[PDB]
Chains A and B, each alone.
Chain A
Amino acid sequence: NLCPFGEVFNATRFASVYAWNRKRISNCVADYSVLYNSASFSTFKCYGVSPTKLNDLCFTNVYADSFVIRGDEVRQIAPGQTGKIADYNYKLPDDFTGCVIAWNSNNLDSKVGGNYNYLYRLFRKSNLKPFERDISTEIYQAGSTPCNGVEGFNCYFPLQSYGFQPTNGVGYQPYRVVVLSFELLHAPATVCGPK
């Protein structure tokens, strides 16, 4: 029973980063070689594990988080980073155990006139904790005047659209990102390599 990685990486549609998707992966054999032999990824790095050893390891829980961000924001999907993605949308732990995988999706996620379906959070009263998700749409109080859900001066709707356009430079183009987290919790293993 092979793990449903084709579902995660080859899905027609990806989530916005503020509403990033989580898929639990369990009770299956994980052929990471379909990934670590492929040459389609612009980013493929792991923390606490080596990419060539994943086929020899067993884990209690495996989660696949996926979303779309700009190419020049992929750097923020790393331990210790700051910026609107790391602070307000998707936060990796400082001691992250897992892998970060990304690839250019300009051919799929850009549109003439701009694809406005992909959103990110621009304002928040505090930084996200690791693996936290915030899907609220409350008006952000940037000044001394309470907003009371009314959008206006100093009172901002907290989400903004990327507006991906196909003629953008590579840094401004959309990138699809999958974060694999490998969890050990003193229980039997559910996900193992093809051994």
Chain B
Amino acid sequence: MGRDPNSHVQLVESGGGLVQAGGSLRLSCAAPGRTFSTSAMGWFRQAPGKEREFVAAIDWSNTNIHYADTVKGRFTISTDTAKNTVYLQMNNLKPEDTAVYYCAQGGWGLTQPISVDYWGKGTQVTVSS
């Protein structure tokens, strides 16, 4: 039910919720990493009234890690060894981190970190002061 609901590739995010400022939260994304082991995995977020923005990216070998400057030192992207799940560990959360967070699968782009092939449905993260 991610942006293409009928495709073979499906991405499902979970773990969103309400968190106090300064707290931690880890998002999960079930992904077909064993099959599509060469594709880039990434996290995006979209807050109300703003455009979707890049957050983090990684390959299924836990290398080629990219971060947006706004989250460096606070967020960590990772994968599990069986290539079944992508994670976004979030630390020292701020109100500006409130958004719907999207998981994505695609290729490594030239003009942007990931040129996306498939989108998830999104999970809502709300940070309160």
Contact = CB atoms under 8 A, between A and B. Distances in A.
Interface of A: 36, 41, 43-52, 75, 78-82, 94-97, 99-100
B117 A78 contact: yes
Nearest to B37: A95
- Interface class of chain A by DSSP: loop
Contacts of A52: 110
Lowest 7 A-B CB distances belong to which pairs? A45-B107, A48-B38, A45-B115, A44-B110, A47-B38, A51-B110, A78-B117
A80 B109 contact: no
A44 B113 CA distance: 11
A137 B110 CA distance: 39
Contacts of B108: 45-47, 49-51
Interface in B96-129: 106-111, 114-115, 117-118
Interface of B: 7-9, 32, 35-40, 59, 64, 106-111, 114-115, 117-118
A59 to B, nearest CB: 14
A75 B4 CA distance: 12
A47 B39 contact: yes
Contacts of B38: 47-48, 79, 95-97
A43 B115 contact: yes
A94 B36 contact: yes
Contacts of A45: 106-110, 114-115
Interface centre among B37, B106, B108, B115 (most CB of A within 10 A): B108
Nearest to A99: B107
A138 B108 CA distance: 39
Contacts of A95: 35-38
Contacts of B109: 44-45, 51
A76 to B, nearest CB: 10
